[PDB]
């Protein structure tokens, strides 16, 4: 039967609690990592935070017009009045999103600000039957909604390559060269617990907010369809995960269209 093993895994760092429950076994709330709500570093990363390097808009409205320069950078502003991605948004090949920033002329409540407002969906960490811990939604999530950010320790591609515990690494760029990675193993938020699914209800999108250093996008998960209350969250970890892990275990997502079973 269900036991609530934590009131809030985030210790009050998010806008709402993220409880943890276990209806499967005797395990308490996972505690072998440090919950952080924003990315951190160990070794320095030298993100370009020169305020004069920001591209910004000069909008006199709420940034919902054709003329918003931040929208232009994003191709167009993809957010509707409710903060959801427009039906036209390419989920198969997402564009980079540039949200408004502190250099823009607009107000803090303009249209082009969603990820920077943080996690607001009611989520729950729970014990799955056969994939360890997972994350579910406690309420219906309409399509195109921002759900959570992949947060953790920002490291180099080189450093990521010597991290023995590799289950929580997320590459920020797929190219060769100077590339960075978020490791959610030691420091991470709720997204570290999101399991892989071959027909996923989340898609990761690269987003820029307070800085526009292209080496360091932030990773935001948006829903790809209506997620019903109770449903487990999942995204496609991608081939660079399964190329390594597929030699060790098979995918248990359960999709008829599973590509890693």
């Amino acid at each position: 039967v269900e036991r609530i093993v934590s009131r809030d895994i985030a210790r009050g760092y998010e806008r709402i609690p993220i409880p943890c429950v276990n209806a499967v076994d005797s395990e308490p709330c996972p505690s072998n990592y440090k919950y952080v709500s924003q990315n951190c570093v160990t070794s320095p990363m030298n993100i370009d935070r020169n305020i004069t390097h920001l591209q910004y808009c000069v909008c006199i409205d709420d940034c919902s017009s054709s003329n918003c320069m931040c929208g232009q950078l994003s191709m167009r502003c993809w957010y509707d009045k409710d903060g959801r991605l427009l039906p036209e948004f390419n989920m198969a090949e997402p564009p980079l999103i540039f949200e408004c920033n502190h250099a823009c002329s607009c107000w803090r409540n303009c249209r082009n600000r969603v990820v920077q407002n943080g996690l607001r969906a009611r989520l729950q960490l729970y014990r799955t039957r056969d994939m360890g811990w997972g994350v579910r939604s406690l309420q219906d999530i309409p399509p195109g909604t921002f759900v959570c950010e992949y947060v953790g320790e920002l490291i180099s591609d080189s450093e990521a390559d010597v991290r023995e515990e590799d289950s929580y690494l997320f590459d920020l760029d797929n190219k060769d060269g100077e590339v960075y990675c978020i490791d959610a193993r030691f420091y991470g938020n709720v997204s570290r617990f999101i399991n892989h699914h071959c027909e996923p209800n989340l898609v990761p999108v690269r987003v820029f907010m307070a800085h526009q250093d292209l080496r360091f996008p932030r990773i935001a998960f948006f829903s790809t369809r209506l997620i019903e209350a109770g449903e487990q969250l999942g995204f496609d970890y991608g081939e660079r995960f399964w190329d390594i892990k597929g030699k060790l275990f098979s995918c248990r997502c359960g999709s008829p269209k599973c590509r890693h079973s």
């Binding site: 997402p94 992949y150 591609d157 990521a160 390559d161 010597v162 991290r163 023995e164 590799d166 289950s167 690494l169 997320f170 590459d171 797929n174 990675c181 990761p204 999108v205 690269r206 990773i219 970890y237 991608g238 081939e239 660079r240 995960f241 399964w242 190329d243 390594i244 892990k245």
Partner: peptide
């Protein structure tokens, strides 16, 4: 790579 990486 030597380690598993999630990616877009």
């Amino acid at each position: 790579k030597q380690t598993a990486r999630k990616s877009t």
